[PDB]
Amino acid sequence: SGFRKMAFPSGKVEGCMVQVTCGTTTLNGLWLDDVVYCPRHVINYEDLLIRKSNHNFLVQAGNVQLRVIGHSMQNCVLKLKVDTANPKTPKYKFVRIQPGQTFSVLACYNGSPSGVYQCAMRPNFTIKGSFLNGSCGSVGFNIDYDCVSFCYMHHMELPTGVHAGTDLEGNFYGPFVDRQTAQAAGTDTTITVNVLAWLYAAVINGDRWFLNRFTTTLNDFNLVAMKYNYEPLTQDHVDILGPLSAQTGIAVLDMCASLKELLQNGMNGRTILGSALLEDEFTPFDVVRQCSGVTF
Amino acid sequence: SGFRKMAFPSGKVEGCMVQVTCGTTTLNGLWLDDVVYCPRHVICTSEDMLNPNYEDLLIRKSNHNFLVQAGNVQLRVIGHSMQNCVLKLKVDTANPKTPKYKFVRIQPGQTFSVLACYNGSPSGVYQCAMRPNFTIKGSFLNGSCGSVGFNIDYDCVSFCYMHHMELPTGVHAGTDLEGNFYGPFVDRQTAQAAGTDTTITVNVLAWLYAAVINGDRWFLNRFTTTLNDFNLVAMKYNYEPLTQDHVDILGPLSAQTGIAVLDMCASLKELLQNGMNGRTILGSALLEDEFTPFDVVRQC
Ligand SMILES: CO[C@@]1(C(=O)Nc2cncc3ccccc23)CCOc2c(F)cc(F)cc21
Ligand SMILES: CO[C@@]1(C(=O)Nc2cncc3ccccc23)CCOc2c(F)cc(F)cc21
């Protein structure tokens, strides 16, 4: 029993964290094989990069200095070719994730991991992370069997305290730029499929007070959801919740009527899984994984 | 900016997780140097679980009864001894991934990261606190026994917890790494119940300071209180008494934000009386008590 916000074991990623210094800026890099990836703002980025030489980038893997033998830019990520292939390089992939998808963040400072937390890519493409100055280059990942899927690299903090970054190919999530200018996160919405997954996790854990006898059409649910700034629920989401619906005996549209009532009436002093708000940072796969004990 | 529940990087602990099998039972062990530590109930059957004589059961076992697996490699057990509720299986190979470590016993309110494992394989990492009633509100399935709680200070892993059991309410009980249980619990299937839980007051105050540092100030008020008046109000809401030690510990956060501890106590009293009124503090509609003053300063 129990339900916790749980991150993937960070070990495979800790072995890849390095410190990258260029001039006055020190941030984190991800060392995979003989390439170190980091935010390009460490340095007109094409013009600034041409002016740099390999010896301007100081890369430190623990107490060892790596020698940079090349540099190139891919979108908003800088790739520093190094002379040594990382012996701790895990099986990995670069994947771009969708809003609503969750991942673990290994927060680093000076190439040293300090914390690991779980979070979701918000529908407005920001992450509600925990990052201080020097965290840039910290990465988000998932682990599938023995394979690390890198999905995020931290670049900046928006004026509201939320965070923006790119996939490992340097493409920003959202309409953000890595330049000093006025940027604002759009109005956020609740990840509906994740709230439903979390309501299924609550039922599995014995918390059933919110369940009702009613069901709803997908269209009627979406009309209500739209009013409360909730993301539309698609037939794909209904299909993905299928296994949890089968396990608990609560059809997805049945759980949708519970969510509809929860929105129109509140919790009335009650909590679900120790929370007074509807949690939207557990995907349906996260719920199945935690309420089944899948290991990595 | 931002405030998250944050666990320590689990890598140093993942390199210590092993699978320990004795008879039909399979749980997790912690391999440090040439010793594997695990819950002593691994020697039990369902028939022993109610009133087990662990000294008697252990004397009947031999080194070849314990099957230890580190990844795809079987370790050979060359000795076994029991220290309180932990079994120590001496092995022939020292773990090359053994980090700098210490065994520390923690006090209620203290937080730590848990590396949840099944069959000697880590599946997740989460943060939690030792509740005032000595239980942890973990996320553990059958097979998670032997999963450990830890903190990391600079390069040293302080092991503070090893999971042993789930109480009938879904909360969890375990020991420090010397086998001493936290709380009045025993590793028997006899009727056991967690005492009524209470809120870790010093942790809530630390979290209210974290909210002020992050720009949240709506809950602040013009009032101050005596420590005794705060404790009389606190107790009525099942909040732990706040000691002068707690007031002293909150000193640095009080200095950083310019709000005196008894001033923040008066804000907490108001929050307990009124609730949040549709508002949130650091994205939460409840008062968070699993961030210590040390965690708040660390993260901020
Ligand atoms: C140094 O990178 C910046 C930044 O956001 N950094 C941060 C990223 N995370 C957490 C932070 C917590 C506190 C302080 C800064 C944080 C600040 C300057 O403006 C910019 C900028 F125009 C573009 C850019 F891609 C980054 C940055
Ligand atoms: C080792 O088995 C026990 C156990 O609690 N295990 C578990 C630990 N965590 C999560 C669990 C989730 C679901 C099922 C069991 C869980 C159950 C039987 O009674 C006992 C017992 F008397 C003493 C003991 F120290 C352990 C155990």
Account of the protein in words:
Chain A has eight helices and 13 strands. Chain A has 296 residues and is an alpha+beta fold. Chain A folds into three domains: 1-14 and 91-188, Beta Barrel (Thrombin, subunit H), CATH 2.40.10; 15-90, Beta Barrel (Thrombin, subunit H), CATH 2.40.10.10; 189-292, main proteinase (3clpro) structure, domain 3. In chain A, a hairpin with a 2-residue loop joins strand 4 and strand 5. In chain A, helix 3 packs parallel to helix 6 (242-248) and helix 3 packs across helix 7. Chain A is elongated. Chains A and B meet through helix 1 and strand 10 of A and helix 1, strand 9 and strand 10 of B. The complex binds ligand QP6 (2 copies). One copy of the ligand CO[C@@]1(C(=O)Nc2cncc3ccccc23)CCOc2c(F)cc(F)cc21 binds at residues 41, 131-133, 135-136, 155-157, 178-180 of chain A. Chain B: Residues 1-300 form the Peptidase C30 domain. Chain B: Residues 1-300 are cytoplasmic.
